[PDB]
C-alpha cells in the first residue's frame, strides 16, 4: 500500500519500491526486508521529512521498529555507508 523511493550514492537514478504494508505502520524492518540483495548492516537510512520547527529535513532513523516518515504521502530516503 506504500511506495519509498531512494537514494544511493553510487547510482546515476533513485529506486523506487512498493511495499505491501499501509502508509502508517511502515517501518524501517519492512523497507530493509525488501532490500535482500543489499548489505543492510552497513548503511544509514535517512528519510525527507518535515519537521515542525525547522521545515524540510533528512531525519536519521536506526531502529527497525520506527515508523518511516512520510513526506506528502511519499516516503523518500537515502542509503549511507558507514
Same mark, same amino acid.
Given at each position: ?15 523506487? /519500491? *512498493? ?8 517501518? @524501517?524492518?519492512? =523497507? ?7 548489505? #543492510? ?15 524540510? /529535513? *533528512? ?8 515508523? @518511516?516518515?512520510? =513526506? ?7 542509503? #549511507?555507508?558507514?
Amino acid at each position: 500500500d506504500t511506495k519509498i523511493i531512494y537514494h544511493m550514492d553510487e547510482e546515476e537514478t533513485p529506486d523506487l /519500491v *512498493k511495499l505491501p504494508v499501509a502508509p502508517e505502520r511502515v517501518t @524501517l524492518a519492512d =523497507f530493509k526486508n525488501v532490500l535482500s540483495n543489499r548489505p #543492510v548492516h552497513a548503511y544509514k537510512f535517512f528519510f525527507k521529512s518535515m519537521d515542525q520547527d525547522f521545515g524540510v /529535513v *533528512k531525519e536519521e532513523i536506526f531502529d527497525d521498529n520506527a515508523k @518511516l516518515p512520510c =513526506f506528502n504521502g511519499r516516503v523518500v530516503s537515502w542509503l #549511507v555507508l558507514a
